[PDB]
C-alpha cells in the first residue's frame, strides 16, 4: 500500500520488485580432512621437520577436542538426553548443535574403523569404498605439491634444499590455517561455519569438495554465495591428525505473499537548494505488513533476495505513515557535493530535476523548463516523445497515473543531519533546550 | 576562519594542511582475458576434466552476457539512441555506462576478427599485431603453470597424477574467481569495478597488466591506491571462453581554493577528570565554506587527499559555530581508560595536560606546574627552552599568538555519551521528559 506518486514527487522513484526466499530442509554428508601429508617417498631426507610440525599441529588441535568433549561426555539416550548440571551455561543454538553432534556419532564411529586405510593414503583425493555403509572421501592438504614438485626433483638438487622447501610449505599452510582454526574458534559445537572457511584446511579449494560430493546449478551458486552451505566438526584425531566434517546442503523455499521493493533516490529542488530524502531503500512487505530488512547480510539477485535467516526488523510509525502518503513526515538532507544522481527511469517514464540538469526535447527542438516552485519533472511521450539529456537520447512511453501530475504540489519534510558527531551535537542541543523549557516550567 | 587558539585550549591542536584532488579525463585501452588454458602439449592424458571445466565456466559466464544483451539490443544510432520502454527501469549511471558500452562496440568488433589467433595462443602474455588498428594483448589465466610445471613432468610421474593436478589447479582458479565474477556481479554494465578486482581472472596479477599496458609513476601509484583505475566488460565469448575489457586511466586534477585541515585531539583537565572533545578531525574548506568529508573512502598522503569522487557532506550550524570560536557549543566525553594522548607538538610548541603527565624544565631543573582551574598548558621557549617529558627531551620554538595564553580561561561544553546503546537510552529518556513536560502543559 505504498503511495508511489507522492514518493516519486519527493524523489523516491520505484524500482524492481524481488521475491523473498530462505534456506530450509538440509541433507547431510560426511567427509574426512587430513592435515598432514604422506612423505614416505622422500623419507630419506625429511630431516626432523615432521616432528616439529606434529607438535605445532597437536597444540593447535587440542582445544577443539577439549571443547567437543564437554558435550560428548554429557549426552546419551533417554530421544536425546542431556545433563544440564554438567553443562552449566549454554544457549539454545549450542544445545541444538549438541543434539546434532550426538546424532552424527554413529556415522563417525563407522568412519573411524578405517583408520589404517586413512593413514596410508598418498593422493590428494581418495575414495574409501570398503562397504556401502561407509563410502567416504579423504582430502589431504599438501599431497599434490609433494607428489608433483618435491618427489621428481629429489635426484636433481641437494635435498637440504628439499627439506627447507618442505618446511616452508608446511609453515605457509599453518599461517593460512591459523586465521580460521586458531583461538578465534571459541565455539566449535555450532554448525554456522561456512564451507568456504572449512576449506582453509584444504588450501581454500572448496570447489573440489563440492564437485566431489554433489552437483552444481544456478541455485547451487546462489546457495553458495548466500552462506547457506555450512559444516560442523564432529571428530578430531590427535594421533593421525585428521578431522571428520558433516556438510549440510539446504534448499531455498519461497515465502508466500511477501516481496521486497526497491526505491531509487533522486535529488530534488527546493528554495535554491538540492535535497535527498532520508528513507530506507529496501522495504519488506509480508501479508500487507510493512517492515525494514537488514539486507547487508543477504544476497541480492536480479529477481530475488536470498538469505540464510529471516532478517525482518521493526519500523517506526512515522516512517510507515510517510511511506503511505504523509510526505510531510519524510526527512530530507541537504546536498553539498557535485556528484549526485539527478534523474531516473521507471516504466519508460523519466523523472528528472531539470533545474540542476539540462533537459530538452528532440522532437520540437525546445528546452524543457521547470518552475522554481516544483521539486521534479515527470516526462513521458505525451509531452516529449524523445528526450535528450547530455549525450543520451531516449524515447519514452506513457505514464500511468494522474494526468495532472506536474500541476499538483507536495508538502515537504523537515531537514536532518545524519553525521555521527552531528547526531551527538543535536542530542546535546535538544537536551539543553528541554532543560531551559523545564526551567521556565 | 577556524579559531585555532580556542580550539587548542579545548584540546584540538591544529595539524598539517592537505590539498584536495579528484580524478577526471580518462583515456581508454582494450585487453583480452582468456579463462581457459591451452593443453595441446599434454592432450594425451587431459582425461575429461576440460569438458567439466567448460560446463562450469559456461554456467558462470552466461548471466553476464544475458545482462549485457539488455543494453546491446536496445541501442542504435540516432548521437546514441536508446529505447526507454524496452529497458524499463534504470539509473542514470547505468544509462551512461550503456552509452559507453555502445561506444566500445566498434573496437570490440575489430578485435573479434582475430578469434582464430586468440584461440591458438600458448603463452601467458601474447601481443597480437596483425594491423595497427587492432594491436591487442592477450592474457591466459593458467598458461604459465602448465608450461613450467605439468609439461616437463609428463615423462617422470604417472600422468593420472598429472590429470589430478590439472583438475586441482582449475578448481582452485574457479574458487578464487567466484568471489568477483559470481552472482555478486549483478550489474556488469557499470564501469565502477577496479582493475584489482578484474585481475582475479588473471590470478590477481594486476601489475603485469598495468606494466604491459602503460607506465608507472608516483601519481600512478596514488591513482592505483585510490581505486581510480577501473574497467568495464564489453564482450563475452561463450565458445572460446574469453572476455574483452576496457581499462580507464584518469588524471588527478587539483581543486582550487580548497584544503583539508586535520585536528589532533588532546585530553584536558576539568573538575578532577579527563575529557576529550567530540569534534570532527578532518574539515574541508572550499571558498570559505566549511563542511564535513567522508574520508574513509579517500586516500590520505602526506601532502594531499585523493578521492575518485567528491565526498563533501553537510554540517550543523552548532558545530560550525563551535569551530569558529563558540567553545561552549563543543561536546566533550569523559575518559575512563588509561591509554589516551596527553600532549602534542604544533609549530615547535608543546600543548600538554600537565595535571595528568609529569612536565619539567631541563634548563632550570624545576617542575612545570598546572593549576587545577586550567585545561591545558602551552609550553614554548619564552618560559622553557628545553622540556623533558619522561624519556624524551625536546627543544622548543616561539609561540605565535597571544602573549597571555596561559592567563586566559575558556568556556566549557556539555558532556555527551557516544555509545549506540547509550544513544538509544538517551533518546528514550529525552522522550519521556518531553512527555512529562507536555503533561504539565
Amino acid at each position, epitope marked *: 500500500i505504498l503511495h508511489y506518486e507522492k514518493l516519486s514527487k519527493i524523489g523516491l522513484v520505484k524500482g524492481v520488485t524481488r521475491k523473498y526466499k530462505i534456506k530450509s530442509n538440509p541433507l547431510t554428508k560426511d567427509i574426512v580432512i587430513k592435515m598432514i601429508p604422506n612423505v614416505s617417498n622422500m623419507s630419506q631426507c625429511t630431516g626432523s621437520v615432521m616432528e616439529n610440525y606434529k607438535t605445532r599441529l597437536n597444540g593447535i588441535l587440542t582445544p577443539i577436542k577439549g571443547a567437543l568433549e564437554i558435550y560428548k561426555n554429557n549426552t546419551h539416550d533417554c530421544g536425546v538426553c542431556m545433563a544440564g548440571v554438567a553443562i552449566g551455561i549454554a544457549t539454545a543454538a549450542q544445545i541444538t548443535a549438541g543434539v546434532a553432534l550426538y546424532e552424527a556419532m554413529k556415522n563417525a564411529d563407522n568412519i573411524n574403523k578405517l583408520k589404517s586405510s586413512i593413514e596410508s593414503t598418498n593422493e590428494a583425493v581418495v575414495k574409501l569404498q570398503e562397504t556401502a555403509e561407509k563410502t567416504v572421501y579423504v582430502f589431504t592438504a599438501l599431497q599434490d605439491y609433494i607428489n608433483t614438485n618435491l618427489v621428481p626433483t629429489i635426484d636433481k638438487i641437494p635435498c637440504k634444499q628439499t627439506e627447507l622447501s618442505l618446511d616452508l610449505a608446511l609453515s605457509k599452510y599453518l599461517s593460512d590455517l591459523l586465521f580460521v582454526f586458531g583461538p578465534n574458534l571459541q565455539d566449535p559445537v555450532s554448525n554456522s561455519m561456512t564451507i568456504q572457511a572449512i576449506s582453509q584446511a584444504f588450501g581454500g579449494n572448496y570447489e573440489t569438495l563440492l564437485r566431489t560430493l554433489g552437483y552444481a546449478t544456478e541455485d547451487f551458486d546462489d546457495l553458495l554465495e548466500s552462506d547457506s552451505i555450512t559444516g560442523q566438526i564432529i571428530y578430531v584425531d590427535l594421533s593421525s591428525y585428521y578431522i571428520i566434517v558433516r556438510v549440510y546442503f539446504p534448499i531455498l523455499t519461497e515465502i508466500q505473499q511477501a516481496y521486497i521493493q526497491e526505491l531509487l533516490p533522486v535529488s530534488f529542488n527546493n528554495d535554491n537548494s538540492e535535497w535527498i530524502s532520508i528513507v530506507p531503500n529496501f522495504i519488506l512487505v509480508r501479508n500487507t505488513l510493512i517492515s525494514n530488512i537488514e539486507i547487508g547480510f543477504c544476497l541480492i539477485t536480479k529477481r530475488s533476495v536470498i538469505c540464510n535467516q529471516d532478517y525482518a526488523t521493526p519500523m517506526t510509525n512515522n516512517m510507515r505513515e510517510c511511506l503511505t502518503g504523509s510526505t510531510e513526515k519524510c526527512p530530507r538532507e541537504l546536498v553539498v557535493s557535485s556528484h*549526485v544522481p539527478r534523474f531516473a527511469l521507471s516504466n519508460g517514464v523519466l523523472f528528472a530535476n531539470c533545474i540542476s540538469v539540462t533537459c530538452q526535447c528532440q522532437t520540437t527542438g525546445r528546452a524543457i523548463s521547470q518552475s522554481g*516552485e516544483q521539486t521534479l519533472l515527470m516526462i513521458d511521450n505525451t509531452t516529449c516523445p524523445t528526450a535528450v539529456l547530455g549525450n543520451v537520447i531516449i524515447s519514452l512511453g506513457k505514464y500511468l497515473g494522474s494526468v495532472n501530475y506536474n*500541476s499538483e504540489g507536495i508538502a515537504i519534510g523537515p531537514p536532518v543531519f545524519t553525521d555521527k558527531v552531528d547526531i551527538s551535537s543535536q542530542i546535546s542541543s535538544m537536551n539543553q533546550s528541554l532543560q531551559q523549557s523545564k526551567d521556565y516550567i | 576562519i577556524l579559531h585555532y587558539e580556542k580550539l587548542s585550549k579545548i584540546g584540538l591542536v591544529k595539524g598539517v594542511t592537505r590539498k584536495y584532488k579528484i580524478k577526471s579525463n580518462p583515456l581508454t585501452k582494450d585487453i583480452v582475458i582468456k579463462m581457459i588454458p591451452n593443453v595441446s602439449n599434454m592432450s594425451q592424458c587431459t582425461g575429461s576434466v576440460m569438458e567439466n571445466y567448460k560446463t562450469r565456466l559456461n554456467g558462470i559466464l552466461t548471466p553476464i552476457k544475458g545482462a549485457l544483451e539488455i543494453y546491446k539490443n536496445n541501442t542504435h544510432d540516432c548521437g546514441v539512441c536508446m529505447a526507454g520502454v524496452a529497458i524499463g527501469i534504470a539509473t542514470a549511471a547505468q544509462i551512461t555506462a550503456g552509452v559507453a558500452l555502445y561506444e566500445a562496440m566498434k573496437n570490440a568488433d575489430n578485435i573479434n576478427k582475430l578469434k582464430s589467433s586468440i584461440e591458438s595462443t600458448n603463452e601467458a602474455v601474447v601481443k597480437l599485431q596483425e594491423t595497427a588498428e587492432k594491436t591487442v594483448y592477450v592474457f591466459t589465466a593458467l598458461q604459465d603453470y602448465i608450461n613450467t610445471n605439468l609439461v616437463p613432468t609428463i615423462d617422470k610421474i604417472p600422468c593420472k597424477q598429472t590429470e589430478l593436478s590439472l583438475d586441482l589447479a582449475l578448481s582452485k582458479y574457479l574458487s578464487d574467481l567466484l568471489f568477483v565474477f559470481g552472482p555478486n556481479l549483478q550489474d556488469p554494465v557499470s564501469n565502477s569495478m577496479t582493475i584489482q578486482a578484474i585481475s582475479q581472472a588473471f590470478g590477481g596479477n594486476y601489475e603485469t597488466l598495468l606494466r604491459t599496458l602503460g607506465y608507472a609513476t608516483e601519481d600512478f601509484d596514488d591513482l592505483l591506491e585510490s581505486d581510480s583505475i577501473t574497467g568495464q566488460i564489453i564482450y563475452v565469448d561463450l565458445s572460446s571462453y574469453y572476455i574483452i575489457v576496457r581499462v580507464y586511466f584518469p588524471i588527478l586534477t587539483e581543486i582550487q581554493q580548497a584544503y583539508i585541515q586535520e585536528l589532533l585531539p588532546v585530553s584536558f583537565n576539568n573538575d578532577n577528570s579527563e575529557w576529550i572533545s567530540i569534534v570532527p578531525n578532518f574539515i574541508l574548506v572550499r571558498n570559505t565554506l566549511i563542511s564535513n568529508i567522508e574520508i574513509g573512502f579517500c586516500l590520505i598522503t602526506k601532502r594531499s587527499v585523493i578521492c575518485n569522487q567528491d565526498y563533501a557532506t553537510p554540517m550543523t550550524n552548532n558545530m560550525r559555530e563551535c569551530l569558529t570560536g563558540s567553545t561552549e557549543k563543543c561536546p566533550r566525553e569523559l575518559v575512563v581508560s588509561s591509554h589516551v594522548p596527553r600532549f602534542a607538538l604544533s609549530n615547535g610548541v608543546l600543548f600538554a595536560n600537565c595535571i595528568s603527565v609529569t612536565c619539567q624544565c631541563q634548563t632550570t631543573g624545576r617542575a612545570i606546574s598546572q593549576s587545577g582551574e586550567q585545561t591545558l598548558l602551552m609550553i614554548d621557549n619564552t618560559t622553557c627552552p628545553t622540556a623533558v617529558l619522561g624519556n624524551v627531551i625536546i627543544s622548543l620554538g616561539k609561540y605565535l599568538g597571544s602573549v597571555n595564553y596561559n592567563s586566559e580561561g575558556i568556556a566549557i561544553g556539555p558532556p555527551v555519551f557516544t555509545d549506540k546503546v547509550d544513544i538509544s537510552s538517551q533518546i528514550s529518556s529525552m522522550n519521556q521528559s518531553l512527555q512529562q513536560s507536555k503533561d504539565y502543559i
Partner: antibody, heavy 118, light 113 residues
Framework: EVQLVESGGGLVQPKGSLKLSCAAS????????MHWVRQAPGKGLEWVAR??????????YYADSVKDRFTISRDDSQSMLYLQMNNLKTEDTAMYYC??????????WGQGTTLTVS | DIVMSQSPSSLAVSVGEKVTMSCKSS????????????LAWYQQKPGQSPKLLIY???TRESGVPDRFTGSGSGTDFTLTISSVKAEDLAVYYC?????????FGGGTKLEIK
C-alpha cells in the same frame, strides 16, 4: 500563448492610493511566482515586489523603498495579480510591468501601465 | 546583497562589427552543488518591453539569433555579438537572480554608426 495584460494606471494626487491589476492567460497560473518591476522615465529597471505560489505559503517580498507602503496579492481562481499602493510619492511615477518568473529568472514580461503622481 | 555593475555605459558600433560588453558582480554567482551561474542578459528595444536573451550564463532563449554569445564565470561575465545588425539598436541589462533583492545592472546602450 503566454499573455500578461496590466491595467489600473493613471494620474493620482500625492499621498494618495491606487491599485494595479494584471490578467494572465496561456499558462497554469497557480504554479509560478510573480513579480512587479518598475522603470522610471529614461532610467533603468528596478525590482519592486515578489509573490510566491501556494506550495510556499504565499511568501511575499518587497523592496526597501516601498516596504511599508505597497502590498502584492494574487487570486488563483481568477488568475489575477494585484498591487495596492498607499502613501504615493512623486518618486513613484513610472511604468510598471507584470513579470512571470520561470525557473529562477524572469521569463515573461507584460506591456506595462503608467503611473503619474503630481 | 550583491551589487551589479556594467561597462561601458554607451558604445557606438558599425554594421558588421564585433561588439563586447562586460558585467561584474561583487560576489560569486556560482552555485555550489549544480555548478551553475545565476546571471541573465535582457534586451530592451526603444518603445518595447524587455526581452530575455540569456537566462543561464551561456544558454540562449528560444528564438534568439545565433550571433549572441554569453560567457564568463565567478564574478566576471561577457556578452558578445559577432556581427551587429541594424535591428540590435537596444539597451542591454545584466541581472543576478541568485538571492534577494535580485537587482538589475545599470545598462549598456548600443549605437549604430
Amino acid at each position: 500563448e503566454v499573455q500578461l495584460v496590466e491595467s489600473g494606471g493613471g494620474l493620482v494626487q500625492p499621498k494618495g492610493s491606487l491599485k494595479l491589476s494584471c490578467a494572465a492567460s496561456g499558462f497554469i497560473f497557480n504554479t509560478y511566482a510573480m513579480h512587479w518591476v518598475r522603470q522610471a522615465p529614461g532610467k533603468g529597471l528596478e525590482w519592486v515586489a515578489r509573490i510566491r505560489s501556494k506550495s510556499s505559503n504565499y511568501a511575499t517580498y518587497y523592496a526597501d523603498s516601498v516596504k511599508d507602503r505597497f502590498t502584492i496579492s494574487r487570486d488563483d481562481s481568477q488568475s489575477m495579480l494585484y498591487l495596492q499602493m498607499n502613501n504615493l510619492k512623486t518618486e513613484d511615477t513610472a511604468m510598471y510591468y507584470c513579470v512571470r518568473e520561470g525557473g529562477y529568472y524572469f521569463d515573461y514580461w507584460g506591456q506595462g501601465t503608467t503611473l503619474t503622481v503630481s | 546583497d550583491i551589487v551589479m555593475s556594467q561597462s561601458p555605459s554607451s558604445l557606438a558600433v558599425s554594421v558588421g562589427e564585433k561588439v563586447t560588453m562586460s558585467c561584474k558582480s561583487s560576489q560569486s554567482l556560482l552555485h555550489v552543488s549544480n555548478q551553475k551561474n545565476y546571471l541573465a542578459w535582457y534586451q530592451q528595444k526603444p518603445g518595447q518591453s524587455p526581452k530575455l536573451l540569456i537566462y543561464w550564463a551561456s544558454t540562449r532563449e528560444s528564438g534568439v539569433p545565433d550571433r549572441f554569445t554569453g560567457s564568463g564565470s565567478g564574478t566576471d561575465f561577457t556578452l558578445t555579438i559577432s556581427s551587429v545588425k541594424a535591428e540590435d539598436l537596444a539597451v542591454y541589462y545584466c541581472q543576478q537572480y541568485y538571492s534577494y533583492p535580485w537587482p538589475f545592472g545599470g545598462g549598456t546602450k548600443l549605437e549604430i554608426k
